[PDB]
């Protein structure tokens, strides 16, 4: 019953306010990357992708 | 899209630390009840009144 | 101790339940002696709601009825 | 602003294995600085320093599963 077990990512690094990295375990066998956007909505970044990278950095150089 | 498309009701209310209620938007047809547990986990809740009700009251009556 | 502290510092009563696009309910604990009601808005701003006010009951309904 | 920074203080050290969740919050009107919030297995949450070689060592232990 993963939180992030569906589509993954096509977002604008512009509107991400926070990025949460959740470890795999009980309810989810894989690591989930959830992203909170300005408008308050959430999304799942791709554990298996590059984009989530610059995203973190960006958030840290703010 | 959403993160919540496989909601659950198997959760123990004393183990919830916070509950996020996301308003239905374009990319997601329905409202979402994100529950974060004591161990940091996240799960999607069934949009059934008695549940989140009994929950928001245990969260707000700490 | 506690590296965390309450996110909320003051609550907004005069809020337009319309623009509220999300709501987070936080249980009390080490981080904060009281529970917290943080509502984000369509514009991206965030405000805290009063626990001794029905408004949140209202807002949560409006948010869950789609 | 109704909000302030959650991280009123930080911890320079703890074991990455204990971390179940790591939340990265970018600076804004709520807080003049970015924040690194880690949740541990026991349930506690700590704030970390923004010094790359540590959280990257944590972010890895988190995704290697």
Swiss-Prot record, chains A, B:
Q: What is this protein called?
A: Platelet factor 4
Source organism superkingdom: Eukaryota
Modified positions (Phosphoserine) are 18
Cysteine pairings via disulfide bonds: 2-28, 4-44
The entry's heparin-binding residues are 53-59
From Swiss-Prot, chain D:
Where are the disulfide bridges?
A: 5-31, 7-47
Binding site residues for heparin: 56-62
Q: Which residues carry this modification: Phosphoserine?
A: 21
Record's protein name? Platelet factor 4
Supply the source organism's classification: Eukaryota, Metazoa, Chordata, Craniata, Vertebrata
Tell me what gene encodes this: PF4
What part of the entire protein does this chain span?
37 to 101 of 101
């Amino acid at each position: 019953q993963c939180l992030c077990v569906k589509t993954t990512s096509q977002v604008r690094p512009r509107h991400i306010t926070s990025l949460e990295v959740i470890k795999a375990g009980p309810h989810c066998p894989t690591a989930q990357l959830i992203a909170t956007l300005k408008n308050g909505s959430k999304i799942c970044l791709d554990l298996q992708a590059p984009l989530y990278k610059k995203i973190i950095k960006k958030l840290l150089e703010s």
